[PDB]
């Protein structure tokens, strides 16, 4: 594993020139100035030899072929340009990841900033790259240094055809390939000179090498919610570090790492392994090793189905009609999982069967304020066939294997083994006190908790069969899908936490497409309005989500909470799939229509009336709701009398103010589309909720 170290860093660093190039812009080539800047730090030769001569030593031809398998002056283009929409640029503001700042929502007014602010990027690179030991111990701490800084800078960025993918992911997905090229060429048994297969000939694409593995932590939903209530947060976070330890021990039994990975969010996780005579039976062995671990603990409530797809390098490009077979790359591993999800638990795992952690995980619930998670051995909370999992304090260095630090990337990014799991910030209060904290300082608002359960609609559809509208030799690259899968994973696992700034709620599992938030009812809806409105800016709204909110009292069980809002977003997955559903199986408004026509159009004007008058009140509101629920044709006329009778009763310094209310109220009551009526039936509910005294 000595040559695998030096082949890996130089694959990540073969385009470290273009961040040293475009900051303090020279004129010469970028592949040379990368190693020129690199030789001043630690003076390592073999890594620098991979940087000197990879664009024109039997080590840099692996980088030259894998730079092509990544994708085969101008700011970074947006990943949501190549879809069913053809008028946007939305170039990225090239700043760094911050974790305590607002997301750089990419607008079309960021084309010129291609030279200036890159010096703020390259300054931070000197901090962590200098004191760097280049072993496999700090093997992921450099992967922090690209995702936190090199993210929003572009790659080649010339007048080429790719123009879209990043430099962080292009460093990862090339270095993901280059180790898998090594294991495919080593397990084949020939090392007699790379140029002969890679540069002398180009027929390396025409064989099924570097297969795509995957797994699926099934039973992940029914484990958590079938349980004075914040113990569920640690239960949903325990299955993330289990979901990462599966993804890390599978790469410990191989010679790979977090570069050789495309997704880990919530049970599902994709990979790029090496299609060898070795990796196919270390998957069967690790699947057999881990599923018997789940039997002795969780007794087939959980199951992991390792499926793999043996694809070829030709089926990843854009030149041929490989996008018509690009879904088949994921499908071959998805057909194996869906077949392994059926035929589970082979013979002697069942013949042996036909003949604690329940208390131990309570100790992990008090370890949630800690931020450093350790892979210990036979101590507490087992997560693997000989390992355990504990949340230790700052008093670390007690027999660690992985130091699973918190979501920082910046604060704890100075220690050893920076392994990162991005989960669930802003657990503000305990769950039984979100109802009682709905009254303001004035003391009005209704004492009810409310719980958001949302997901993004066609995320698996747009991941696989996305980028597929522009020609027959269309774009549809794995790199265009890895950066898509990075963009959603960087949205949910990071940016939700700043959307929950001080919104009086507790995010539980901002994971894959799912978000399960639970908090006070006023700011659980203010969260959801500031969730998708930030998301449609983030996605150039063409790929939508759907929420379901359920208003409950205090001390209702969470299994009743999470199901009755779980089967209340199912009513929002059937409206048009782009819809909120509030508190019940009706009120299923389209989400874009919910904000511009209920939450800000009507509810402000209902708030603007009763907070700028004196003589009306809740009695007038309640008889408007009762005439809005029934709606006969008789109640159109009966409401025309009721609103005109109250002009006569006002004090004539408010009559024209009320006349602008009733000419606007009776406008949306009498229609044919039946649309604005139930909107104002809902807009009166949220107004009369927020004004109720004890």
């Amino acid at each position: 594993k000595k040559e695998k170290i030096d082949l890996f860093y130089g694959a990540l660093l073969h385009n470290i020139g273009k961040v040293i190039q475009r900051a303090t812009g020279e004129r010469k080539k970028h592949a040379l100035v990368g190693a020129d800047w690199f030789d001043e730090i630690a003076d390592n030769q073999v890594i620098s030899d991979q940087i000197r001569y990879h664009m024109a030593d039997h080590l840099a031809y692996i980088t030259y072929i894998a730079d092509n398998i990544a994708s085969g002056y101008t700011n970074q283009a947006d990943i949501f340009n190549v879809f069913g929409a053809q008028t946007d640029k939305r170039y990225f503001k090239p700043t760094v990841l911050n974790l305590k700042s607002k997301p750089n929502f990419a607008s079309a007014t960021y084309e010129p900033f291609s030279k200036g602010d890159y010096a703020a990027i390259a300054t931070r690179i000197k901090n962590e790259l200098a004191e760097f030991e280049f072993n496999q111990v700090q093997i992921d701490s450099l992967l922090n240094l690209f995702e936190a800084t090199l993210s929003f800078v572009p790659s080649s960025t010339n007048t080429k055809e790719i123009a879209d993918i990043s430099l962080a992911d292009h460093s990862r997905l090339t270095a993901a390939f280059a180790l898998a090229i090594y294991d495919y060429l080593e397990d084949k048994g020939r090392h007699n000179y790379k140029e002969d297969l890679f540069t002398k000939v180009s027929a390396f694409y025409e064989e099924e090498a570097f297969l795509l593995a995957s797994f699926d932590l099934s039973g992940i939903q029914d484990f958590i919610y079938n349980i004075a209530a914040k113990q569920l947060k640690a239960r949903s976070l325990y299955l993330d570090f289990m979901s990462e330890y599966i993804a890390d021990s599978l790469l410990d039994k191989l010679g790979l790492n977090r570069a050789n990975m495309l997704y880990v969010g919530g049970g599902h996780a994709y990979f790029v392994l090496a299609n060898t005579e070795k990796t196919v039976e270390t998957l069967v062995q690790f699947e057999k090793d881990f599923n018997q671990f789940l039997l002795a603990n969780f007794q087939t409530r959980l199951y992991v189905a390792f499926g793999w797809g043996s694809f070829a390098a030709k089926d990843i490009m854009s030149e041929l009609n490989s996008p018509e077979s690009y879904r088949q790359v994921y499908q071959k591993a998805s057909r194996m999982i869906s077949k392994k999800k059926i035929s589970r638990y082979d013979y002697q795992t069942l013949m042996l069967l036909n003949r604690d952690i329940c208390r131990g995980l309570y100790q992990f619930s008090k370890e949630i304020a800690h931020d450093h998670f350790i892979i210990t051995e036979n101590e507490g909370l087992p997560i693997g066939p000989n390992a355990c999992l504990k949340g230790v304090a700052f008093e670390k260095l007690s027999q660690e294997a992985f130091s699973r630090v918190y979501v920082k990337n910046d604060y704890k990014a100075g220690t050893v083994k920076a392994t990162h799991v991005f989960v669930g910030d802003y657990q503000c209060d305990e769950i039984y006190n979100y109802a009682a904290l709905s009254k303001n300082e004035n003391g009005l608002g209704i004492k009810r908790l409310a719980v958001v359960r949302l997901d993004v609609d066609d995320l698996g559809a747009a991941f696989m069969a996305g980028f597929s509208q522009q020609g027959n030799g269309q774009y549809s690259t794995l790199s265009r899908s890895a950066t898509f899968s990075r963009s959603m994973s960087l949205f949910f696992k990071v940016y939700i936490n700043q959307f929950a700034s001080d919104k009086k709620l507790s995010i539980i599992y901002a994971g894959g497409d799912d978000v399960f938030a639970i908090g006070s009812w006023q700011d659980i809806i203010a969260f959801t309005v500031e969730l998708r409105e930030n998301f449609i800016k983030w996605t150039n709204g063409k790929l939508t989500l759907s929420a379901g909110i359920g208003l409950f009292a205090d001390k209702t069980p969470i299994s009743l909470m999470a199901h009755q809002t779980g089967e209340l977003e199912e009513a929002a997955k059937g409206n048009e799939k782009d819809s909120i559903s509030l508190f019940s199986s009706d009120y299923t408004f389209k989400f874009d229509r919910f904000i511009t026509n209920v939450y800000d159009d009507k509810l402000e004007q209902i708030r603007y009336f009763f907070n700028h008058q004196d003589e009306r009140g809740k009695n007038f509101i309640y008889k408007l709701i009762e005439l809005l629920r029934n709606h006969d044709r008789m109640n159109m006329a009966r409401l025309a009398y009721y609103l005109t009778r109250l002009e006569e009763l006002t004090r004539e310094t408010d009559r024209d103010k009320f006349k602008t209310f009733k000419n606007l109220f009776y406008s949306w009551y009498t229609n044919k589309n039946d649309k604005d009526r139930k909107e104002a039936e809902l807009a009166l509910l949220l107004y009369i909720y927020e004004i109720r005294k004890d």
Partner: protein, 55 residues
């Protein structure tokens, strides 16, 4: 055998006829603005037991 159950029969023959309020719905446009509580199958006035208990 110290479990019994007895009943006070009475006859509520009233004066100043009573209004135990019922459906406070949005009434008709010139009709009774506040009706009384009634038996459904006969539409006769009732005096409910809950209005006799809290009072």
């Amino acid at each position: 055998m110290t479990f019994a159950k007895i009943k006070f029969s009475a006859q509520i023959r009233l004066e100043t006829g009573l209004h135990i309020g019922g459906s406070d719905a949005f009434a008709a446009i010139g009709a009774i603005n506040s009706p009384v509580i009634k038996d459904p199958i006969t539409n006769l006035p009732i005096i409910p037991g809950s209005s006799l208990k809290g009072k």
